[PDB]
């Protein structure tokens, strides 16, 4: 009956880069999901499948918390049936998605005047991602028809590009922190409730 | 199996990401200097600027290794071509260096050139503010003559050898990029290829400029005849009733605009003029309120408000006196959703209109920020300015001013205040059209080779007299280089853009005012509150330069080419008034009279 450690996910000092997104597995705890519906400025929430008020009286076996940072312009891609650099190459939600996506603006925390180069996203990849797949490889992307042998050059691109977060960017280019909640029901007993 | 077009697309995706970051650092570094002039900020501006230029030259060279001939997607081709123009880097390194030295020497001579009064060797004037204050405000014939002549004889004579070497090297650069000369290279800005129904050739711009200039001639001759008659009354011993206007009596250093002749030419000299400055002061407006009103203007036609960053990061007032700033009003698009205006705003009517003009640019910039980096511009070199200009047309009308409460409803508009307004407009807008065409025709002919070196100044003044109806007050031999005494000529900027802008702006204004269902003469039109006008404009603004400029123009005005009829439509009430005023005067000019031929 311990409380579900969502605080260390949402209030964490540094998020993952979206190409190397972080997943926290939740188990054996009670979560009060009505803790949301609150903190209205810049917290946005969108659930797929069942109302937040209604799942606070519901039990699941595992919950997963995926967190990362992206541009505001790109939050719309953290949603089922979307395309783009983020949904294709960094973090992909399945068509039949039954969870929630929380996002908030973190310009105060993730940008600085000299430019925050901490956060990366993958820009090139041979194929799109299967849902909930992660790719942290740093192999040189072969655009041309010559091998790259692991050095960047003509038609040989390092595939990870840095966001550049500065506090004077427009809202669409500012950093947003994103938390993605998946709920699953396997044969094993349920241990996450409300 | 990977095609060249697929390779190009991927190359441009990398370029777009890198370019946007490096450009933001350069633009912001430029901002910090222009708002806070310090030795430290010069360095940072030059460091970030140099990193940006170095990236561009590297990416231009890398871009050339993809052949255009093998690209089908036109929006990819357009981006590749724009980055592929290496320009000066087609010359040998020795000639690049020579040319860049020449450009720098011409620029600093223009901006540091000084003349000293031939009474005190140590009391000297620069062009800005010294000589410009004489040329816009003095009524004294000899003082103006001294400024006009010594500017061209002290500074212009310095630019003559440099300018000769500039033509040779710019032509070599142009010919090595397969243009026929530097003038043809400049006209390249209007070229459209490969889009059926919307193509436009470089040689077609000369034709359309000349064909439209013929239709402007009668309005210009009558404007010229009326101005000459009024100045003949002020200067009876200096002006011939059949000759050209002397070139030092036109209200600035070149006769580029005739704005400042208004006080000697105003048709109805006791009708109150419209100046809402006193009302703004009475109502306690500040810079904030002005920009709020201009924002209200664009919102009323369905365009977006300004971003939150615009209000926080712009500089709308002079920053006091500790920090110094470059106060020329400019609209800034830094990328990454960051838009700002720099303006040392005073509470006056001129700065109210200027705010609307400058915010018009921002509106253009915001609308095409969704295009890829290299397509984020006006559809051609004249579009951006035209968008700015039509905003101030609406904002200044009595209808708009009464509507926002700066003008008393009891202000009476009649025949005569409209004639005064139209005349003042014409002095600026129509008076510059022969100046602009004539100047660019001269450069075009010099670059083509049609004017030998030993006839440069001879052909310049023959064309001044014959096309512009203006005559030099002092004979000039070939040690002079009078065109280079104008900023754009010695600072290597194309000039026909001011001609095409002027025609575009009345084409736009006529189209929008029709969409706004405006009743009556075109010059009284205010497009405020018309979401149909705002949408029609927006459909062109969002294109940037992803489409041929001919198409972009069709979107707003339903025609594919530059057209003079809207300009003539705007000035028709003045034209018929001038035609009746001139019934006792000679219309036109003889080229053989001059102030010094006695
Ligand atoms: C020329 O290349 C463009 C970029 O490679 C194409 O735009 C892209 O088309 C994709 C179609 O599957 C679409 O998902 C992408 O979002 C889009 N990207 C951008 C930046 O627009 C373009 O294709 C045309 O434009 C888009 C908007 C769609 O309407 C397509 O159906 C169009 O054919 C390419 N143009 C041509 C003529 O091939
Ligand atoms: C994060 O911290 C704030 C302030 O301490 C708190 O109100 C909020 O509930 C915390 N988040 C969670 C998920 O507990
Ligand atoms: C102006 O620049 C100096 C150094 O370049 C800096 O210390 C100062 O804070 C700046 N002023 C403002 C208002 O930014
Ligand atoms: C711009 O207009 C929209 C529509 O009313 C509004 O929601 C938004 O807050 C406005 N922006 C600002 C900075 O006022
Ligand atoms: C625009 O609409 C508002 C609301 O009716 C009005 O107060 C304003 O005067 C209108 N402007 C014009 C030029 O009609
Ligand atoms: Cl001149
Ligand atoms: Zn402008």
Numbering used by the authors:
A (entry chain E): 333 to 526
B (entry chain A): 18 to 615
From the paper:
As a newly reported VOC, the Omicron variant has caused great concern with 32 mutations in the spike glycoprotein including unprecedented 15 mutations in the receptor-binding domain (RBD), which would have significant impact on the viral infectivity and the protection effects of approved vaccines and therapeutic antibodies. There are 15 mutations in the Omicron RBD (G339D, S371L, S373P, S375F, K417N, N440K, G446S, S477N, T478K, E484A, Q493K/R, G496S, Q498R, N501Y, Y505H), with ten in the receptor-binding motif (RBM) for ACE2 binding and five in the core subdomain.
The Omicron RBD in our study contains the Q493K substitution, which was reported at its onset and was recently replaced by Q493R mutation. However, slight difference in the ACE2-binding affinity was observed between them, and the measured binding affinity between the Omicron RBD and ACE2 is approximately 2.48 ± 1.17 nM, exhibiting a ~2.5-fold increase compared to the WT RBD (KD = 6.34 ± 2.19 nM). One is at the RBD 477 site, in which the WT RBD S477 is not in contact with ACE2, whereas the N477 in the Omicron RBD forms interactions with ACE2 S19 and Q24. Due to the G496S, Q498R and N501Y mutations in the Omicron RBD, newly formed interactions occur between Omicron RBD residues (S496, R498 and Y501) and ACE2 residues (D38, Y41 and Q42). Specifically, S496 forms hydrogen bond with ACE2 D38; R498 forms new hydrogen bond and salt bridge with ACE2 D38; and additional stacking ring interaction is formed between Omicron RBD Y501 and ACE2 Y41. No interaction is observed between Omicron RBD N417 and ACE2 D30, whereas salt bridge is formed between WT RBD K417 and ACE2 D30. From the perspective of our complex structure, the S371L/S373P/S375F substitutions not only changed the side chains, but also induced a main-chain conformational change, which would disrupt the specific binding of the antibodies to the hairpin loop (residue Y369–C379).
